[PDB]
Amino acid sequence: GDLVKPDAFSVKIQDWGSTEYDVTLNLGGTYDWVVKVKLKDGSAVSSVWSANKAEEGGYVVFTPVSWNKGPTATFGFIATGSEPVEAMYLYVNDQLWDVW
C-alpha cells in the first residue's frame, strides 16, 4: 500500500571501512517503532546506539530504548564493510511508514 509517512527517515552515512548509519525518525508521535534493516551477506552490526537489536527473518531489527520513542527519535549503528545496508524499513503498529 501507500507509505504512511514517507518523510519519516533522515539518514546520514559515513563509510571508512565499516559504515556508520545515523538514523533520525521524524515520527510526529511517540511509538513502539521498529526499523528492519537488510544487510549484505558477510556484514554484521558491530555498534548500536540508543536502540535494542534483534534478528528476525534474516533482517536486523532495531527497536527503541525506553526514552527514544519519538516524536523525534534518533539512533545509530555501525555495520562492517562498505555500505552494507541495502534497505531499511520503518514500521509503526504493523504498517510500513517509510523506506530508506
CATH of the domain at 14: 2.60.40.290
Give the integer Cα–Cα distance in Å for 45 and 36. Answer: 13
Biggest distance spanned by C-alpha atoms of the chain: 37
Distance CA 19, CA 81 (A): 6
50 with 64: CB under 8 angstroms? yes
What does R_g of the chain's alpha carbons equal in angstroms? 13
Cα-Cα-Cα-Cα dihedral sign, residues 98, 38, 56, 79 = negative
Domain residue limits at 49: 1-100
Q: Is 8 left (phi over 0), alpha (psi -120 to 50) or beta?
A: alpha
- By what method was this entry solved? X-ray
Query: 3-class SS at 15?
Result: strand
Beta carbons of 27 and 44 less than 8 angstroms apart = no
**Number of folded domains that form the chain:** 1
At 62, list the grid cell: 532495531
